[PDB]
């Protein structure tokens, strides 16, 4: 099969080997897209994903490549944004960005800060109890958002009672 | 609870003759006729059978567990007076021995029980139901085939076109 992705306006797409790079006003994302007998190429203003193979496993990856590229289009123009909200019951939780990591102090009264390191060009912006996580690469941003939530995970106590943590609130579309 | 691995094969001669065999235990099978006994099978649009896929011996205790777990489901679903009938067609004619209580001296076994010989492709159970209740008999049969040795096929012998579509 063959699928054609029209590159949108003010976006450039370059393909070197199995790597594809997408540049826009919001930035640049490069991705490895590598699967047997699937060719990904830039022809003019349209990115082309094709294979001589019609089998279920091939179609799966084709559909996956399509969505990966489209997400890259969206990331370099409109950008990707995750909303997040800190909640705590008893102990006030301090959430700040220090360098390339986001740091959480006084979680559940803990003396030791919890840390996670931001992926790539992702930006974390804190305003009061709200956070926004943003960048051009949906992989990096989504993960950075996730890591923040995961960082407040508690295995040993009833989560229904102990709810403190930072949570993803808004999730991106398109 | 002796394992069926002991009894399930047809390797032995047919041993059925009660004139030459005493002390045969009673069958644990409660009834061969279930649901509505006063109603003819032919009154139903749908006929479904459980077919045995390997020639085997199924002992009477296994027949009963199987029958039970199928009929209990029908009763639970269609209701105790529910409109359907189920037949267990086979009877446990083959008498079983165990050499228990000497070793292999005078080894001919004492009489321990009974089994039904079923050839591959035969109908063990046949159920007759209304179109709406057909998935309930399929389900009863699924429970039933888990309680007997062989793999089984579930077959709709009448009114399949009426089912689903």
């Amino acid at each position: 099969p063959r699928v054609e992705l029209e590159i949108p306006e003010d976006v450039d797409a370059e393909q070197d080997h199995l790597d594809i790079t997408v540049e826009g006003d919001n930035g640049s994302v490069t991705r490895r897209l590598w699967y047997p007998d699937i060719d990904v190429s830039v022809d003019g203003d349209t990115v082309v994903i094709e294979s001589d193979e019609d089998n279920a496993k091939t179609m799966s990856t084709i559909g996956t490549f399509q969505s990966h590229i489209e997400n890259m289009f969206h990331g370099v123009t409109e950008g990707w944004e995750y909303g997040m909200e800190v909640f705590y019951s008893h102990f006030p939780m301090q959430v700040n960005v220090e360098g390339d990591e986001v740091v959480i102090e006084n979680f559940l009264g803990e003396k030791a800060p919890r840390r996670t390191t931001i992926h790539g060009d992702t930006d974390v912006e804190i305003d009061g109890e709200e956070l926004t996580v943003s960048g051009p690469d949906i992989e990096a941003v989504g993960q950075t958002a996730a890591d923040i939530e995961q960082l407040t995970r508690i295995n040993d106590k009833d989560v229904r009672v102990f709810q403190d943590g930072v949570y993803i609130t808004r999730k991106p579309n398109r | 609870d002796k394992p069926a691995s002991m009894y399930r094969d047809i390797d032995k001669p047919a041993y059925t003759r009660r004139e030459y065999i005493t002390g045969i235990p009673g069958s644990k099978i409660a009834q061969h006729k279930m649901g509505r006994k006063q109603k003819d099978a032919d009154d139903y649009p749908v006929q479904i059978s459980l077919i045995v896929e390997e020639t085997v011996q199924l002992r009477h205790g296994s027949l009963e567990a199987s029958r039970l777990s199928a009929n209990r489901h029908l009763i639970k679903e269609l209701g105790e007076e529910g409109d359907y009938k189920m037949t267990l067609r086979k009877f446990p004619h083959q008498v079983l021995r165990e050499n228990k209580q000497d070793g292999m001296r005078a080894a001919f076994g004492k009489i321990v029980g009974t089994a039904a010989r079923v050839q591959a492709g035969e109908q063990l159970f046949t159920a007759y139901c209304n179109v709406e209740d057909a998935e309930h008999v399929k389900e009863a049969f699924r429970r039933a085939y888990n309680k007997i040795t062989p793999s089984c096929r579930i077959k709709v012998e009448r009114g399949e076109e009426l089912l689903i579509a």
Partner: protein
Amino acid sequence: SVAEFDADVIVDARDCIMGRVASQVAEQALDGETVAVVNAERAVITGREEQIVEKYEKRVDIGNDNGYFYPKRPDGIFKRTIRGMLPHKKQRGREAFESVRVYLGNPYDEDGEVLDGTSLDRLSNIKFVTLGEISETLGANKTW
């Protein structure tokens, strides 16, 4: 090691299937040829990395006082693979085997040649591993 082997044949193992090369290198060495296998680290083994790695790990693991000494490094592994295709305890076999050497990278001035049937197409295959990767997993020091 650095000894300057004089080879009638220089084989490039880069993106090539190790056993298909080894089979051919074995037969040539028994035919009288002196052989250098080059870029061993970039040689390739098809299949699922996790089971492949378990096998080689098991070989590192097995042993006793008498001993089973299984190479971790890519050149060693390739060498051993070839030894398995030679009667290396017989005289003609040990001679052939000693006429073969495997190298990390390419100590020669000339590029090696790619043997027919041995080459793997990376655009057609994602399930495979490089010898270099196996060695790293085995704990080898990476000098290549």
